[PDB]
């Protein structure tokens, strides 16, 4: 087997060699069971799988450290993750980033951010 006898999690999971280091597949709903890219957490939030690091896990990529409100889904945008929330805060409006995508009721004002971080936008 693998460090599994090394490495149960709380009872009810069942780890296993993972890749070298020996990871509790939940026999439950494994943590990852619904996609949450290993390094995130296990999020089924009650039928709404929203994997975000928030758990101050193993500092590893963390595509969510800087993680937008509930509904953003987190890329990385030139390395730095940018939340191209579900319904993408910016990225549906192409005005990249810099203004913002205030479509006023269907009005799309790429509005410069009268106060984002000092860019030339």
């Known amino acids: 087997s693998g460090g599994c006898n090394d490495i149960y999690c ?14 509790c597949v939940q026999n ?6 619904i996609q949450c890219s290993k390094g995130t957490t296990c999020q089924m ?6 994997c975000i690091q928030i758990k101050a896990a193993p500092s ?6 800087i993680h937008c409100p ?6 990385m945008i030139d390395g730095h993750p940018q939340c191209v929330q579900n ?13 913002t995508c205030q479509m006023v009721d269907g009005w799309p004002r ?10 030339p936008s």
Do not use: E, F
């Open 70 to 75: 509930k509904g953003t889904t987190c890329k």
């Open 60 to 65: 590893r990529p963390s595509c969510s450290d």
């Open 87 to 99: 319904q993408p805060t910016c990225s549906d409006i192409q005005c990249s980033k810099g203004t």
């Open 10 to 23: 709380p009872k009810g999971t069942t780890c296993k060699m993972m890749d070298g280091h020996p990871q």
């Open 45 to 50: 939030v009650d039928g709404w799988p929203r």
């Open 28 to 33: 439950q709903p494994s943590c990852s069971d």
């Open 110 to 119: 790429c509005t410069q951010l009268k106060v984002a971080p000092r860019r």
